[PDB]
Design an enzyme around this catalytic site. Structure first.
Site, short mmCIF file in Angstrom:
data_model
loop_
_atom_site.label_atom_id
_atom_site.label_comp_id
_atom_site.label_asym_id
_atom_site.label_seq_id
_atom_site.Cartn_x
_atom_site.Cartn_y
_atom_site.Cartn_z
N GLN A 125 5.74 -10.04 -52.40
CA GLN A 125 6.86 -9.35 -53.01
C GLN A 125 6.99 -7.91 -52.53
O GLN A 125 8.09 -7.42 -52.32
CB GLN A 125 6.73 -9.38 -54.53
CG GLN A 125 7.90 -8.71 -55.24
CD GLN A 125 9.24 -9.30 -54.84
OE1 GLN A 125 9.52 -10.47 -55.10
NE2 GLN A 125 10.07 -8.49 -54.19
N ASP B 12 -1.24 -10.47 -46.56
CA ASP B 12 -2.28 -10.97 -47.46
C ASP B 12 -2.73 -9.87 -48.42
O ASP B 12 -2.72 -8.70 -48.06
CB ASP B 12 -3.49 -11.46 -46.66
CG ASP B 12 -4.29 -12.53 -47.40
OD1 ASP B 12 -4.26 -13.70 -46.96
OD2 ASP B 12 -4.94 -12.20 -48.41
N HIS C 8 6.20 -25.49 -44.18
CA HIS C 8 5.18 -26.05 -45.04
C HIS C 8 4.06 -26.71 -44.25
O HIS C 8 4.27 -27.71 -43.56
CB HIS C 8 5.80 -27.05 -46.02
CG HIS C 8 4.87 -27.50 -47.10
ND1 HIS C 8 4.25 -28.73 -47.09
CD2 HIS C 8 4.42 -26.87 -48.22
CE1 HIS C 8 3.47 -28.84 -48.15
NE2 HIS C 8 3.56 -27.73 -48.85
N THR D 286 -2.74 -27.42 -46.16
CA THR D 286 -4.09 -27.00 -45.78
C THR D 286 -5.13 -27.76 -46.61
O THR D 286 -6.31 -27.79 -46.25
CB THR D 286 -4.28 -25.48 -45.96
OG1 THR D 286 -3.90 -25.11 -47.29
CG2 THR D 286 -3.42 -24.72 -44.96
N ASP E 237 1.60 -19.94 -52.31
CA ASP E 237 2.69 -20.81 -52.77
C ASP E 237 3.25 -20.39 -54.13
O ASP E 237 4.43 -20.59 -54.40
CB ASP E 237 2.22 -22.27 -52.87
CG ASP E 237 2.06 -22.93 -51.51
OD1 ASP E 237 2.50 -22.34 -50.50
OD2 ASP E 237 1.51 -24.05 -51.46
N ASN F 187 -0.35 -27.87 -50.18
CA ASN F 187 -1.06 -29.12 -50.39
C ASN F 187 -0.20 -30.26 -49.86
O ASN F 187 1.00 -30.08 -49.60
CB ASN F 187 -1.36 -29.31 -51.87
CG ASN F 187 -0.13 -29.16 -52.73
OD1 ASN F 187 0.76 -30.01 -52.71
ND2 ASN F 187 -0.06 -28.07 -53.49
N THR G 15 -7.84 -19.44 -46.55
CA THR G 15 -8.70 -18.37 -47.06
C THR G 15 -8.62 -18.14 -48.56
O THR G 15 -9.20 -17.18 -49.08
CB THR G 15 -8.37 -17.05 -46.35
OG1 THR G 15 -6.94 -16.88 -46.33
CG2 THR G 15 -8.89 -17.06 -44.93
N1 LIG Z 1 1.05 -13.30 -53.72
C1 LIG Z 1 0.36 -13.23 -52.57
N2 LIG Z 1 0.78 -12.33 -51.58
C2 LIG Z 1 0.12 -12.21 -50.39
N3 LIG Z 1 -0.97 -12.99 -50.18
C3 LIG Z 1 -1.43 -13.90 -51.11
C4 LIG Z 1 -0.76 -14.05 -52.36
N4 LIG Z 1 -1.40 -14.96 -53.04
C5 LIG Z 1 -2.42 -15.41 -52.32
N5 LIG Z 1 -2.44 -14.76 -51.13
C6 LIG Z 1 -3.44 -14.95 -50.00
O1 LIG Z 1 -3.05 -16.10 -49.22
C7 LIG Z 1 -4.22 -16.71 -48.62
C8 LIG Z 1 -4.23 -18.26 -48.72
O2 LIG Z 1 -3.99 -18.60 -50.07
P1 LIG Z 1 -3.84 -20.03 -50.67
O3 LIG Z 1 -2.49 -20.14 -51.22
O4 LIG Z 1 -4.83 -20.22 -51.73
O5 LIG Z 1 -4.01 -21.11 -49.50
P2 LIG Z 1 -5.21 -21.99 -48.97
O6 LIG Z 1 -5.35 -23.17 -50.04
O7 LIG Z 1 -4.88 -22.54 -47.62
O8 LIG Z 1 -6.47 -21.21 -48.94
C9 LIG Z 1 -5.43 -15.94 -49.20
O9 LIG Z 1 -6.06 -15.13 -48.21
C10 LIG Z 1 -4.87 -15.12 -50.39
O10 LIG Z 1 -5.59 -13.90 -50.62
CL LIG Z 2 3.89 -11.85 -54.59
NA NA Z 3 -0.66 -21.80 -51.35
NA NA Z 4 -3.07 -24.84 -49.79
#
Ligand SMILES: Nc1ncnc2c1ncn2[C@@H]1O[C@H](COP(=O)(O)OP(=O)(O)O)[C@@H](O)[C@H]1O
Ligand SMILES: [Cl-]
Ligand code: NA
Ligand code: NA
Ligand SMILES: Nc1ncnc2c1ncn2[C@@H]1O[C@H](COP(=O)(O)OP(=O)(O)O)[C@@H](O)[C@H]1O
Ligand SMILES: [Cl-]
Ligand code: NA
Ligand code: NA
Lengths: 249, 249
Positions: free
Chosen positions: B33, B8, B115, B118, B64, B54, B165
């Site tokens: 990455q 994260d 997948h 959430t 995503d 989603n 989150t």
């Molecule tokens: N490129 C990324 N690399 C690592 N973590 C990420 C990246 N983009 C988002 N996140 C983290 O992934 C978590 C969940 O993100 P998200 O895709 O918005 O899902 P949700 O809708 O379930 O909250 C967050 O804690 C966010 O900080």
């Molecule tokens: Cl990334």
């Molecule tokens: Na996502």
């Molecule tokens: Na989501």
């Protein structure tokens, strides 16, 4: 092709079903046993029955109790829970149990039980009047949708009771509407694309996210007579599902 | 045996993970990455990555989006959504997409994308401070549990970001606790019976239903050093998960 049989002892639920559902569908006001009894006068078919259960697979109350008594009691429940893997299954998931394995406790023409957890445990109702959508319309739609989506393609009929209308505490007026909508989508068959049905679900559940409403679906709404503006402001509390799926379709 | 990699970009999430998780588990504070880049210095393995998505399979935001860019963009998303069946998938369900079919767009050592919807759509957060349990602790636990349960038994590692989150809006302090609990159960392996783990989940989620707490599990609690009284009054808001799963186990 598949006959849907809605069954419930609660008149409020059956009356609402009649009032909201346009042969291919049957409604039985009464106990599951009475339905199974009269289900022997027309045959002289393979069915699946929906179990609005708990995340652990116990069959101790409500509709599940009917199944419990009908299929063998405690020994059946023990077998059933193990077929489910014996572990916690989340609300929002569905697992099919094939009773065919009853040949080393078979019964009637029911070959499958589509287990759909509606509550983690019946320690309390899931419904909260403060948010009838998150604790009523949505969970009920999800259970009906999962039941329909997981129904084996080989069965003749599908037996479904009111979902979340017992121990879950969701008012019949809310549950029956989500059940009806899910059925209406199913009944529409291929007359509505998979993507447009997705959009209708999205707005029905009140998640107006334009990015997930492709132009092709807007074109389809126009061709089908579905008012895009009424769709975009759909209020599950006040609007008729007939606006999302015109009866003409 | 399976290496769990928590990844994260949010320091709040990674710090909380470190603080709540007891090799077999790795924590990467940074972009997916950067994790994949450094994931090439130790190999000269097959993985699965969890997608907190989603109900429609679109990969347009959050974690995503990383997957979207990494695996091929729009054409990949189109392929991905069709692998998911192209239709609405309920929150509380999980679907595995096998990227192996990339041989008529393959990438690194990731063969699967687990997948886990959430949110129905990112039109708004799912969290509501009025009920942090129903809109926070529970949905997060369910997503982590489903991710772990659906992880193919053949992979070397599992990549998981914070669940709910981001766009879902669940506070890290709530999500990380449910993620930790699910992991702790998983880590316990066979040291805790499937049935007792069921009970721990039931009380963790605050559904104190005695009928679903068998005597055999009480005996097990006694043998394992799990205080049955603290278990029966467990308050996810104030109690440490160490009470449900003592570190000794
Ligand atoms: N490129 C990324 N690399 C690592 N973590 C990420 C990246 N983009 C988002 N996140 C983290 O992934 C978590 C969940 O993100 P998200 O895709 O918005 O899902 P949700 O809708 O379930 O909250 C967050 O804690 C966010 O900080
Ligand atoms: Cl990334
Ligand atoms: Na996502
Ligand atoms: Na989501
Ligand atoms: N034996 C039965 N035959 C037909 N319907 C039943 C029977 N028992 C309960 N029902 C009905 O099934 C519905 C759901 O019941 P229940 O098992 O409590 O599930 P839920 O916990 O999802 O509400 C209710 O509308 C109830 O009236
Ligand atoms: Cl009955
Ligand atoms: Na139930
Ligand atoms: Na039941």
């Amino acid at each position: 092709k598949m006959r849907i049989i809605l069954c419930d002892t609660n008149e409020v639920v059956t009356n609402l079903w009649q009032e909201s559902i346009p042969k291919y569908l049957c409604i039985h006001h009464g106990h599951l046993q009475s339905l199974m009894d009269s289900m022997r006068k027309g045959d002289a078919h393979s069915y699946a029955i929906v179990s609005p259960g708990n995340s652990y697979g116990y069959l101790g109350g409500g509709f599940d109790k009917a199944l419990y008594n009908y299929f063998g009691g405690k020994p059946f429940e023990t077998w059933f829970r193990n077929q489910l893997g014996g572990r916690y299954h989340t609300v929002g998931s569905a697992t099919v149990v094939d009773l065919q394995r009853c040949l080393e406790e078979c019964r009637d023409g029911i070959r499958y039980i589509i287990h759909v957890p509606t509550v983690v445990a019946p320690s309390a109702p899931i419904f909260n009047p403060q948010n009838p959508l998150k604790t009523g319309f949505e969970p009920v739609f999800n259970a009906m949708w999962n039941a329909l989506m997981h129904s084996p393609k080989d069965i003749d009929g599908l037996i479904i009771p009111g979902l979340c209308t017992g121990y879950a505490g969701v008012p019949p007026i809310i549950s029956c509407k989500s059940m009806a909508f899910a059925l209406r989508l199913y009944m529409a068959g291929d007359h509505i694309s998979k993507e447009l049905k997705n959009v209708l679900i999205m707005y029905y559940l009140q998640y107006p996210f334009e990015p997930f409403f492709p132009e092709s679906c807007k074109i389809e709404c126009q061709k089908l007579g579905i008012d895009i503006e009424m769709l975009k402001s759909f209020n599950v509390e006040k609007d008729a599902i007939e606006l999302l799926i015109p009866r003409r379709i």
